């Protein structure tokens, strides 16, 4: 019987968010633990091999990652198992190429190209707030990163707000709030790859999160959960969103 | 008066137990059901019953089943048999007690 | 072994057959049996996941507390009453909730020597 932690992942069981042929082979890259969840990330190796066609063989891909030619969020990463997850910015300076990771309407991830000037801004959902010794306020984002700030600035932030993060130097730029009428891009669910405006927030007790209702560009109304709602602008999207 | 997060008024009695969700350290998280008290003999204990109809795919009729659940009866409310009560999942408490009464929707006499 | 696991009997009564062997993550450990002595003797124990925990096998001093919240480190003379068992008070065993006699007087233990490794109590 099994006796502890896995180190493998068969191709057939891979998450449904990966545009990977499944019956060609049997063994895939098990992502190591990292910023984003299994359900909202892919190894960088597959990004290099499939989504960009730069490497045909994983050994060569790993070699190019060893050269450290790749800038994710303004940081080189050699780990060919890095979970590169949702709303990350991939930058290749050798090619001057910049994409943002975003899901599909179907529920799969694609690299939407973005302008270079946008490549330095990363919006982060405020997952939760906590008090650390010294009465300091630490905010845990959707991607697992953490930011420390003063007690006085605690009310500048609330959970479910979006912080436009300057990833190259880790500088907080703007805080989009969660209030009626914001512009929101969905992350998961049947309403994936939708962008609309908020009319109502459904306060649900008994273990069930807040169901926001989103009004699309064409005026059609639908519903999704709080955590799937990701604000990107007060009235228009501050980033190129398909 | 402390909030349980369930739309129901709090019991008037304030008990000193550590196991009253209104008057103790324990929490609530999981489903909420409703049912009837069938037995109360063991101390601070209750067996809640629940009837429901189940569908037979081959016979297209309905089977009425009776399901029992053990739960803890805090003294503040003091549930008795014949009473319609509300039940919530709770921390494991005994060998079998894994649910707790939160209120008495309607006692026996009514 | 010390196995803190399934009861062999169902709630109704039908005896339960085992289908697998015991698991080291599921076994427990011996009782500390903290006693009154002239010095503090303690054992540190490596635990599940590499944690640690210290265990008083003999206790000499106690941290009594006034209702105000001021603490006094003192000695422990003898245990008055052990509600957990009648054999324990007879054998100077020290357990949470026990009524103890120190130089100050009567105290009630509000800490577990088995897991904490120190004994705290409230003056009565």
């Amino acid at each position: 019987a099994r006796k502890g932690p896995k180190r493998h992942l068969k191709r057939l069981a891979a998450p449904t968010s990966w545009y990977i042929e499944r019956k060609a082979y049997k063994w895939a890259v098990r992502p190591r633990p990292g910023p984003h969840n299994m359900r909202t990330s892919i190894p960088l190796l597959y990004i290099v091999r499939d989504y960009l066609g730069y490497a045909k063989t994983a050994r060569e891909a790993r070699k190019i990652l060893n050269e450290g030619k790749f800038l994710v969020d303004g940081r080189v990463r050699k780990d060919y198992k890095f979970p590169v997850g949702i709303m990350d910015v991939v930058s290749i300076p050798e090619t001057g190429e910049h994409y943002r990771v975003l899901p599909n309407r179907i529920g799969k991830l694609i690299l939407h190209p973005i302008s270079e000037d946008e490549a330095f801004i990363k919006p982060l959902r405020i997952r939760n707030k906590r008090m650390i010794k010294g009465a300091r306020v630490q905010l845990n984002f959707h991607d697992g990163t953490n930011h420390i700030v003063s007690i006085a600035e605690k009310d500048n932030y609330f959970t479910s707000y979006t912080v436009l993060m300057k990833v190259p130097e880790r500088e907080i730029l703007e805080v989009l709030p969660f209030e009626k009428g914001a512009y929101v891009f969905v992350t998961q669910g049947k309403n994936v790859a939708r962008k609309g405006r908020i009319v109502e927030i459904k306060r649900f007790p008994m273990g069930w999160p807040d169901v926001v209702t989103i009004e699309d560009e064409e005026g059609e109304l639908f519903d999704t959960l709080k955590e799937y709602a990701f604000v990107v602008g007060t009235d228009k999207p501050k980033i190129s969103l398909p | 008066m402390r909030d349980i997060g369930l739309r129901v008024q709090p019991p008037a009695e304030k008990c000193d137990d550590p196991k009253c969700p209104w008057h103790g350290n324990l929490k609530i998280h999981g489903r909420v059901f409703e049912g009837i008290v069938v037995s109360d003999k063991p101390r601070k204990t209750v067996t809640v019953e629940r009837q429901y109809y189940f569908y037979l795919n081959k016979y297209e009729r309905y089977e009425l089943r009776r399901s029992k659940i053990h739960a803890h009866n805090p003294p503040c409310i003091n549930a008795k048999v014949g009473d319609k009560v509300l039940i919530a999942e709770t921390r494991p408490l005994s060998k079998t007690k894994h649910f707790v009464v939160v209120a008495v929707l309607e006692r026996a006499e009514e | 072994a010390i196995w803190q696991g399934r009861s062999l009997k169902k709630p109704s009564g039908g005896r339960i057959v085992l289908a697998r062997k015991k698991r080291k993550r599921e076994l427990g450990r011996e009782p500390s049996n903290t006693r009154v002595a002239e010095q503090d003797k303690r054992k540190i124990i490596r635990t599940y996941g590499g944690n640690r925990k210290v265990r008083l096998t003999a206790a000499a001093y106690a941290n009594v507390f006034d209702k105000s919240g001021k603490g006094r480190k003192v000695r422990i003379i003898r245990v008055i009453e052990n509600p957990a068992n009648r054999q324990f008070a007879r054998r100077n065993i020290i357990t949470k909730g026990a009524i103890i006699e120190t130089e100050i007087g009567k105290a009630k233990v509000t800490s577990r020597p088995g897991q904490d490794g120190v004994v705290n109590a409230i003056l009565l």
Partner: protein
């Protein structure tokens, strides 16, 4: 003859990637040396840096697919391109 369907540029690897088709009506599938020495002409490439990976001979077709590399320096191909294909092209004994 040889007709190029595609030439792309791996800038992270400093290499040209060439997809092409070979017309060989009624005549056996060509040897590697000839296709290399004849493709070397019309893109102005150094023979050593250029490597051809696969020439797929289709069943019941006079067109065979072909796919090849073109590096920019001696060191990069040794560092990256594994020894076997160098042996197939003869670039290593």
């Amino acid at each position: 003859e040889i007709r190029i369907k595609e030439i792309k540029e791996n800038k992270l690897i400093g290499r040209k990637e060439i997809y092409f088709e070979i017309y060989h009506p009624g005549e056996p599938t060509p040897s590697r040396k000839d296709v290399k020495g004849k493709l070397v002409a019309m893109l102005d490439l150094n023979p050593e840096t250029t490597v051809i990976q696969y020439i797929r001979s289709y069943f019941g077709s006079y067109i065979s697919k072909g796919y090849a590399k073109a590096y920019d320096s001696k060191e990069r191909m040794l560092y990256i391109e594994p020894e076997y294909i160098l042996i197939r092209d003869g670039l290593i004994e």
